[PDB]
Amino acid sequence: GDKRRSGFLIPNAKYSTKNGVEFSLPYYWNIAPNFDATITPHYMNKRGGVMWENEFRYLTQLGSGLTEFDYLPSDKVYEDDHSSDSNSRRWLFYWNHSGVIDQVWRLNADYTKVSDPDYFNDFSSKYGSSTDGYATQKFSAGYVNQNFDATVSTKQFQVFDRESSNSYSAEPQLDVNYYQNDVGPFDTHLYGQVAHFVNSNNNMPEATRVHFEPTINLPLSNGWGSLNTEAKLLATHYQQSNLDKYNAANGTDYKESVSRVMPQFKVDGKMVFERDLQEGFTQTLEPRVQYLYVPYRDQSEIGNYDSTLLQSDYTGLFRDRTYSGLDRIASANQVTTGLTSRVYDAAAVERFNISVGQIYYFTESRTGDDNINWENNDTTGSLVWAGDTYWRIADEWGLRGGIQYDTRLDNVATGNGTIEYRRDENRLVQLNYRYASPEYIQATLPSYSTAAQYKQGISQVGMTASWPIVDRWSVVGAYYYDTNTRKAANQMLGVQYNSCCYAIRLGYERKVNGWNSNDNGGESKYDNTFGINILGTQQMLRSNILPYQSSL
Amino acid sequence: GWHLRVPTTMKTMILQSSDPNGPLSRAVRNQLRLNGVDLIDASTLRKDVPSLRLDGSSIQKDTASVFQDGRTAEYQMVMTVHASVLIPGHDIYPITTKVYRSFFDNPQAALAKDAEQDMIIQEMYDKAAEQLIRKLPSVQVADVEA
Ligand SMILES: CCCCCCCCOCCOCCOCCOCCO
Ligand SMILES: CCCCCCCCOCCOCCOCCOCCO
Ligand SMILES: CCCCCCCCOCCOCCOCCOCCO
């Protein structure tokens, strides 16, 4: 049917290596003022058909939402690569929803499902690209009000790998929180969780975890200092099942019923020293010390469901958790010390910031299952260092950076730096650089440090630029470069011109798409694409596999 | 020696938003409560008490770096927070702040990574809150005789 609408939209064309010539003819349908739809025939050449891209949007009292369904009945290239089954249809379904009813009820949905793991590698869209390694499928409904909140959710993930697609899922997960601030001088905080973990692989064990965590916190502060103490309990119980086969395959001692209760003592002191400088400028120096103690518990009988190693930002040094989730809580006997230095102008605007921190270990942080293959066996001392910085010379330029170092790796673990020149939306240039050492990948990602795609880590520079050459024309481009392999990862060049009312926009992008086995070791697959689209907005900056983000 | 260090005008303040129980609202309320700022509802007559309006917030998760195979190595989330201090009689003053964080991805432990993504976001909501309160001194000095 489709009427009472706006009409056909102006089509757009594309030429890519995997799809050939492409012709998209959108057709918009304004069903109502608060919900509408859009049907887009998207003809592809060497795919041998028209992919129907369907979009729908709605605005209700229960929340705002969007739904997408792309469908291709048959794919010729995919049929050549995968000729086992005669069925060759390929599709995508997406559903986003978010709503806060009566300022208390919270309804949220972020669902993405695809027909095959090689969908987003071939078909690019707003809801996925070649860089995605898995699709997320989250649902959540909760009740939140000031002193109390309780949310129930279901989390699933579709991993894009035909050989190893093992991933856990919480079905369901309940999170409850109580608060009360003026319990004498103490601020109290109760947290409880009840989760049921299942895996797509039936050989993997299932579990039902119950967690109870009361936290009492005494904060004191005056004019110059702030001393905050905290006592926290961690009671956890595991009802595990389906363990015989997994205990046969791997050398593990997982049992069906496992209990674990851990105390936690944390103290955090902070100071501040102001210092006046020239021309009305005012800098400040804040030191911060924190002691942390958590006893050791043998957690070798407990599985792993949502626990992974965290990264230490400067503020992350003062975090009381090494892993995520609640399956692997490491022992603690640590003394974190840090120092920050800020500056301000005559108008008290924060212009420049430096942060340097370290942590000292009295005893080693054990979990009962510490198989993190470090480069050396340094257990105690000033192991982890971190630092951040930010510089704003004026209203236009900008700078920001951060580096995390670890002595157990004998090299800097993480390191990113970015400088930017930002006039407005149309005029800007940005230079960035990100770095992760092979030791870091070896320690945190054991499986990726073996293959040649992720072994050497990251050393990637990047240059984004939006600049108009002629007063009415406009040009934009991006260029990312790998330092280790001396090769480019993503390149982009595009021009745009607003002639009168509707602008014309030509673009070109080349990107790393896959990894080519069967070679003299291995190489990376590259994809080229040109595009023509025919209000005044620059989506070309955020159209790459590494989108542009303003660092001020 | 060198002198030791929220203004007195903002010791009593109003906190208003369309989502009062949201993460950003509770983070700002908690943080300013740590500084000793007293909170009162708008039901008071309230002519001398300043206001702290939370306009909105959004998170943008983009790919920061990529591996040799064309897959995401680490994401970079950027939390943009829009607020505005309302001094009755002296016009409104808008405030903006950004929080940049990043973390490595791993599809083999996707659920775990989700638990990390929830842990970082929360932290960001707190960090942003701090960056909103440290800019109040710059808003107080903006009140000059013109
Ligand atoms: C298969 C899904 C079909 C379910 C859709 C039924 C939704 C009915 O409830 C919607 C109630 O909200 C009414 C929307 O009101 C207009 C939105 O703007 C109102 C401003 O508050
Ligand atoms: C020495 C470290 C031991 C760890 C501390 C254990 C503390 C045990 O007592 C917990 C009691 O806390 C009660 C919960 O607080 C109230 C929260 O609920 C208030 C409802 O709004
Ligand atoms: C509020 C303390 C701030 C001072 C900073 C340094 C604190 C270092 O002292 C820690 C004392 O604990 C020593 C740990 O002893 C070894 C573990 O065995 C004792 C447990 O029974």
Tab-separated table of C-alpha atoms in Angstrom, chain B residues 4-108:
chain	number	residue	atom	x	y	z
B	4	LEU	CA	45.888	25.652	50.742
B	5	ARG	CA	42.502	25.698	49.021
B	6	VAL	CA	32.753	25.196	45.575
B	7	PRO	CA	31.982	28.871	46.235
B	8	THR	CA	29.934	30.070	49.185
B	9	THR	CA	27.116	31.208	46.879
B	10	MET	CA	26.605	27.603	45.714
B	11	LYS	CA	26.667	25.982	49.162
B	12	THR	CA	22.881	25.760	48.724
B	13	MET	CA	21.783	24.740	45.243
B	14	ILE	CA	18.975	23.221	43.167
B	15	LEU	CA	19.369	20.140	40.958
B	16	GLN	CA	16.780	19.743	38.195
B	17	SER	CA	16.513	17.391	35.217
B	18	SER	CA	13.923	15.514	33.182
B	19	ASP	CA	15.562	12.241	34.331
B	20	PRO	CA	16.215	12.770	38.060
B	21	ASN	CA	16.901	9.078	38.799
B	22	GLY	CA	19.269	8.531	35.869
B	23	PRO	CA	22.949	7.643	36.223
B	24	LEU	CA	24.220	11.151	35.460
B	25	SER	CA	21.739	12.800	37.836
B	26	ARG	CA	22.556	10.489	40.749
B	27	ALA	CA	26.285	10.816	40.022
B	28	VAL	CA	26.150	14.628	40.085
B	29	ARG	CA	23.972	14.620	43.212
B	30	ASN	CA	26.359	12.250	45.001
B	31	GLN	CA	29.473	14.172	43.955
B	32	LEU	CA	28.152	17.595	44.971
B	33	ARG	CA	26.894	16.082	48.229
B	34	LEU	CA	30.489	15.012	48.907
B	35	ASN	CA	31.516	18.685	48.635
B	36	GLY	CA	28.998	19.744	51.299
B	37	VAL	CA	26.492	21.385	48.940
B	38	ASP	CA	22.979	21.356	50.394
B	39	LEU	CA	20.166	20.260	48.072
B	40	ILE	CA	16.632	21.682	48.163
B	41	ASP	CA	13.608	21.127	45.938
B	42	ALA	CA	12.105	23.833	43.733
B	43	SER	CA	8.990	23.901	45.948
B	44	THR	CA	10.758	26.481	48.126
B	45	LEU	CA	10.134	30.130	47.243
B	46	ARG	CA	13.732	30.118	45.997
B	47	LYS	CA	14.892	33.446	44.559
B	48	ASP	CA	18.518	33.645	45.748
B	49	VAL	CA	19.281	29.920	45.346
B	50	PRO	CA	21.061	29.028	42.077
B	51	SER	CA	20.081	26.115	39.857
B	52	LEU	CA	22.052	23.343	38.137
B	53	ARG	CA	20.092	22.041	35.144
B	54	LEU	CA	21.129	18.813	33.400
B	55	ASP	CA	20.200	19.223	29.736
B	56	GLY	CA	21.251	15.830	28.387
B	57	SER	CA	23.996	13.289	27.857
B	58	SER	CA	25.003	10.723	25.255
B	59	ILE	CA	27.660	8.047	24.747
B	60	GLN	CA	29.351	7.442	21.387
B	61	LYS	CA	31.199	4.123	21.029
B	62	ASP	CA	33.471	4.085	17.970
B	63	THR	CA	36.366	1.894	16.864
B	64	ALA	CA	39.650	3.403	18.053
B	65	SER	CA	42.130	0.960	16.487
B	66	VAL	CA	41.974	-2.088	14.226
B	67	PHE	CA	44.000	-5.288	13.930
B	68	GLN	CA	45.645	-6.584	10.758
B	69	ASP	CA	42.593	-8.757	9.999
B	70	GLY	CA	40.158	-5.822	10.014
B	71	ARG	CA	38.540	-6.411	13.410
B	72	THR	CA	38.121	-4.025	16.327
B	73	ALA	CA	41.004	-4.123	18.788
B	74	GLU	CA	39.876	-1.422	21.231
B	75	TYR	CA	36.809	0.808	21.346
B	76	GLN	CA	36.849	4.423	22.525
B	77	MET	CA	33.732	5.716	24.277
B	78	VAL	CA	33.179	9.478	24.539
B	79	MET	CA	30.585	10.755	27.030
B	80	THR	CA	29.283	14.225	26.149
B	81	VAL	CA	27.448	15.975	28.992
B	82	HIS	CA	25.420	19.175	28.570
B	83	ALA	CA	24.380	21.222	31.603
B	84	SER	CA	23.562	24.835	32.480
B	85	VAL	CA	23.752	26.885	35.689
B	86	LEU	CA	20.741	29.162	36.218
B	87	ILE	CA	21.405	32.243	38.352
B	88	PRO	CA	18.010	33.947	38.891
B	89	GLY	CA	18.137	37.383	37.287
B	90	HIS	CA	21.577	37.079	35.658
B	91	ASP	CA	20.670	34.817	32.702
B	92	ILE	CA	21.640	31.164	32.180
B	93	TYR	CA	25.184	29.888	31.616
B	94	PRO	CA	25.724	26.671	29.622
B	95	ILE	CA	28.396	24.114	30.490
B	96	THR	CA	29.692	21.226	28.375
B	97	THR	CA	32.107	18.445	29.257
B	98	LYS	CA	33.610	15.353	27.629
B	99	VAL	CA	34.957	12.074	29.016
B	100	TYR	CA	37.261	9.985	26.813
B	101	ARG	CA	37.910	6.361	27.735
B	102	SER	CA	38.891	3.255	25.796
B	103	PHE	CA	39.144	-0.496	26.286
B	104	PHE	CA	40.244	-3.539	24.304
B	105	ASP	CA	37.623	-5.832	22.782
B	106	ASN	CA	37.453	-9.631	22.899
B	107	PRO	CA	34.627	-11.636	21.264
B	108	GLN	CA	35.735	-14.856	22.995
